[PDB]
Paper text:
Human TRIM72, a tripartite motif family protein primarily found in striated muscle, consists of four domains: the RING domain, B-box domain, coiled-coil domain, and SPRY domain. Tripartite Motif Protein 72 (TRIM72, also named MG53) mediates membrane damage repair through membrane fusion and exocytosis. During injury, TRIM72 molecules form intermolecular disulfide bonds in response to the oxidative environment and TRIM72 oligomers are proposed to connect vesicles to the plasma membrane and promote membrane fusion in conjunction with other partners like dysferlin and caveolin.
Numbering used by the authors:
A (entry chain A): 83 to 396, 398 to 471
B (entry chain B): 84 to 471
Write the structure that this text describes.
Amino acid sequence: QGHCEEHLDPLSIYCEQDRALVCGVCASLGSHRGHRLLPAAEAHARLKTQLPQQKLQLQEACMRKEKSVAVLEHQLVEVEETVRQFRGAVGEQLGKMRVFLAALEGSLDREAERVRGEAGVALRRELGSLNSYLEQLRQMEKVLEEVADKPQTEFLMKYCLVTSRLQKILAESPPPARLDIQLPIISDDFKFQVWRKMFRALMPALEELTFDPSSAHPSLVVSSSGRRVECSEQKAPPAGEDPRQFDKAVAVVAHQQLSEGEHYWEVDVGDKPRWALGVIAAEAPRRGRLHAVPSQGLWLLGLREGKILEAHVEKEPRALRSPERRPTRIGLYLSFGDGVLSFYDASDADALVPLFAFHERLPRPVYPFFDVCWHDKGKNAQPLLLVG
Amino acid sequence: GHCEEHLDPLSIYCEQDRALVCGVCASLGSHRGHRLLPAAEAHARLKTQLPQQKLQLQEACMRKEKSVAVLEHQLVEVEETVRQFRGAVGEQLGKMRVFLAALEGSLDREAERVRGEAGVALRRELGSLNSYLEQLRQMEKVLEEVADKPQTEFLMKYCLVTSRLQKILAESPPPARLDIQLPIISDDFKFQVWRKMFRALMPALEELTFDPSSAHPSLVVSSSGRRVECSEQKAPPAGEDPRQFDKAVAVVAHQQLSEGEHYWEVDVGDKPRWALGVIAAEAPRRGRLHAVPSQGLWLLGLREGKILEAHVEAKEPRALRSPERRPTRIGLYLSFGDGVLSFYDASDADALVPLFAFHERLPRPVYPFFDVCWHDKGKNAQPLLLVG
Ligand SMILES: [Zn+2]
Ligand SMILES: [Zn+2]
Ligand SMILES: [Zn+2]
Ligand SMILES: [Zn+2]
């Protein structure tokens, strides 16, 4: 046909604006009256040359659709990954407690069996003692029935053996005892008692930790085992060869750098009366007397006179309510994910009690830092020990 | 039937050695100085013993067969009590096992939901993008095939192709990111789930209803016994029965608590003065009541809306460390078995906080006691509600 629907005249015109073929009348009185126009010939010539370029536009469009269908198929996997990571991480955290539970129940069930079997067999022993006795009394009744009708010489020797044997049985006979099994007492407090213990069980395994003697204040000696540090009363040859060496702080940091995750490590303080535990930022300065404040790179807990605890927070420290018994072991929890450094009185591993927690984004990495302090003319002689 | 050491007839019997001997043997030193008896008289004397001796034989034989019974019974009593233990741990430990299982299931169900929802979100936008691509590629095929065509059919194909591309370039957005809201699973998760577990340990909240017949005349109990307030109403001056409080504006519950474990929560809102706890049953309720355990009053009290006190045995009540958030619901744990009454800031059930706990043998029975305190001309008008 190649003609107009509305007018039936050859579509010899092309409208540059509406980009569609039109007929003569359409340009004259039609909706295409005032538009920018071209003859079909010049329009065919112009678009022959364009066609590689239009062909390229379509491919640019196809690329951009193919690019977007890529992003979605990647996302469609990231969903199953993120769900697995979540659904997996949950099971793992819960698994800590589930294990703790099964461990505790096993330990009790083993003490159940131990008392069961052990108290069990003492009875089966004394049971045999009574069956042999009854069986002996049974024969003695049988002899006594047959002896009533015996010759003089035979009756007499039987009755002596019988009455003299029954004599010995009566002194050898023990009175029965009542059943007394000592099983662990299971109270109303029980469900709480386990719950309290679960806290220690939530923590990650104690970080492998060893003092760095190459950071040690000269008066400080580190044990060969790498887990004991002491403040000696002897002359100290100072060494300013390394900026990591402590000169005025009387302290030492650990070998291990801490960069990500969650870590827990306990420190036995015993009856030491002045010390400070915590962590140091890596590039923080170690030379001179340092004010204990996080802005100086110091996340620090210190004890004075063995009775007053203080948290070296952002000049004056915060005096913590001293626990009812002086603590003999401190725990340090550290999580970069959550930006937290928690201190615990770990003297009783079954009942951990928090003392204080920093709650800020920490600059990673940090070094477990330990301030032994001066032996103070013989008084602060007690060592610092790493539980492990 | 004669003596071994020499052939002489045993017609002699020795009362001391209780053994037949021969004549020579009574003259021989082996049995010489002993008290002796003829064998005939000994046979006559022991014939009469035989009825009495037979009774002695069975007299002991009876008590031994009964004693093998008591011990044979103990062998099951041991296996039963051990089972009772092993069962008892299962239940208390299961109390956490169920909690943990359920929390996992709830999280597992929300994750699956978020998963499937994103599942169709992408597969939808995906399927649409492909259909665009399939038509977009189809258009390339038109553009190659038509390049050599006559003017009129070529041109209208170029219009039709470019006009479809017109619409497609409008309907589709840039790739855009993946948006999943999952609960954030941090290192802190195991800790929050642990705290939440605490409240789950407590027994089901006691059915408790205020007993209006104990009530101070100026307080009205409403809502099926679970609401009391002190209204500024016409108050009958007092009742006659000692069961009614006349001076303290207080009310006890109907229910008597005599044995076991009990947990009940009391919504206090921003009521600024109150006292919660328990009163011994026959302990006095008439007159000004001094708050001390020796008078049957175990009480945790709030004053000025900010200071909590523990009415322990002293002249002045004991000022508690008040938490940084005003408590809006108080919890009460009770065990006669362990002799404990525990107060908790139960404002947030996922994290109960201990407030104070008495640790003494409790007089049974006891009444949940509630001191509303005077309405103070409109200030302390707020009620006490029992959660359930
Ligand atoms: Zn036309
Ligand atoms: Zn037009
Ligand atoms: Zn003889
Ligand atoms: Zn004799």
